[PDB]
């Protein structure tokens, strides 16, 4: 079409291709770091969850108050992960509210708050930002657990909802339980455990909350980085093929312009 418009389009799409290539490179480096960092964090999280796996704890149905935690970031160029965790959060919140249980939300990341602001924002206790700027570390888990316990909400049962990382391209939105001490001490399945006071359990639960939060942060960061990698790779390939088509169109337009200009010049020379 118009030569200058097509030129600007070609230049802009070239910019898009190379900027998304740069983003893919930085995301590949970040994911390479994150996988090695996650490798022992898996062992740590599994070791934490071992107790609640070995002991078949359940839910004292009469208890109402409930927590839902969603772990994501504040950056949103990777797409589907925030939507998936948000969808799981909406499903659980709706179901448990339909079960007549006071449901509260803590969203780790700006994207959870953004995608649940219009509808469920009244139920949030605290949201945290500046996650994903730096690789997550156990101090972030500590501060999140502190802001949870210090808050004036003594929940009865919670659920952390994150993306477990499977492969460079595979992530699954999983959800793991979080138990209050009232559930733990009022379960007759765990009575076998010896030398546990009513105060040892406070410490153990306050620590395992941070443990599960840290595990979720590690898994979510790894899965997010891999998702951003693959999304940028797909965008780069689409931009490359679109540039390939636009180059052919540009060549055709330039040949047409040359032909028309020579035709007009020869006609004007023939006129005089």
């Amino acid at each position: 079409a118009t030569l200058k418009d097509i030129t600007r389009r070609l230049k802009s799409i070239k910019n898009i291709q190379k900027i998304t290539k740069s983003m893919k490179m930085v995301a590949a480096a970040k994911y390479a770091r994150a996988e090695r960092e996650l490798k022992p964090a898996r062992v740590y999280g599994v070791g934490s969850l071992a107790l609640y796996e070995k002991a078949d704890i359940k839910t004292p149905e009469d208890k109402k108050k409930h927590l839902i935690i969603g772990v994501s970031s504040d950056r949103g160029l990777c797409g589907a992960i925030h939507s998936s965790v948000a969808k799981q959060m909406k499903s659980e919140a709706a179901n448990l509210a339909a079960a007549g249980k006071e449901v509260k939300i803590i969203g780790v990341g700006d994207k959870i708050r953004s995608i649940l602001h219009r509808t469920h924002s009244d139920q949030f206790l605290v949201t945290f930002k500046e996650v994903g700027r730096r690789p997550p570390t156990f101090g972030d888990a500590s501060v999140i657990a502190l802001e949870l316990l210090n808050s004036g909400y003594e929940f009865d049962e919670g659920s952390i909802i994150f993306n477990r990382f499977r492969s460079v391209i595979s992530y699954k939105t999983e959800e793991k339980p979080i138990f209050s001490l009232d559930t733990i001490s009022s379960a007759e399945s765990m009575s076998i455990y010896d030398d546990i006071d009513a105060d040892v359990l406070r410490n153990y639960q306050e620590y395992s909350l941070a443990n599960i939060i840290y595990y979720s942060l590690k898994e979510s960061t790894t899965s997010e980085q891999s998702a951003r990698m693959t999304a940028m790779d797909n965008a780069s390939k689409n931009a490359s093929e679109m540039i390939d088509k636009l180059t052919l169109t540009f060549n055709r337009t330039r040949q047409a312009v040359i032909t028309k200009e020579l035709i007009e010049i020869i006609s004007g020379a023939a006129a005089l």
């Binding site: 022992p40 455990y193 359990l201 153990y204 620590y207 443990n211």
Partner: protein, 132 residues
């Protein structure tokens, strides 16, 4: 037999390996765990855990705090926020920081601040005894 897992957030020392005896320091009191210990759920206090390997060999690690779980089926998970090999610490630094911490110990602003500083002294004292 035992299936032991010693883990810090940034490091794994035993990944479901097997050992003969693990002497852990806990808040209520240090104790040793063997092949069929009774299930316990202790939390940790700054100390050193010694791990007896399958042979007569032994190893030591300083754990700042954390949690020890002894499952019914002899599975043991010892998680520590900062567990460092015993050769990664300075006696001079530990002594200096303990002395300083006690130097503002008497300046107890509020009970919470006194508790915070005094936990600093407790960790430093346990570390120094680990190295003295």
């Amino acid at each position: 037999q035992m299936s032991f897992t010693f883990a810090s957030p940034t490091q794994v020392f035993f990944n479901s390996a097997n050992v003969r005896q693990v002497d852990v320091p806990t808040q209520t009191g240090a104790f040793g765990i063997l092949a069929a210990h009774v299930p316990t759920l202790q939390v940790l206090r700054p100390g050193l855990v010694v791990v007896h390997a399958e042979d007569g060999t032994t190893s030591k690690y300083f754990v700042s705090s954390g949690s020890v779980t002894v499952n019914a089926d002899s599975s043991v998970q010892l998680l520590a926020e900062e567990a460092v090999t015993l050769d990664m610490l300075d006696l001079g630094a530990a002594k200096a920081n303990l002395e300083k911490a006690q130097s503002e110990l008497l300046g107890a602003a509020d009970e919470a601040t006194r508790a915070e500083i005094q936990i600093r002294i407790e960790a430093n004292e346990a570390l120094v005894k680990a190295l003295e």
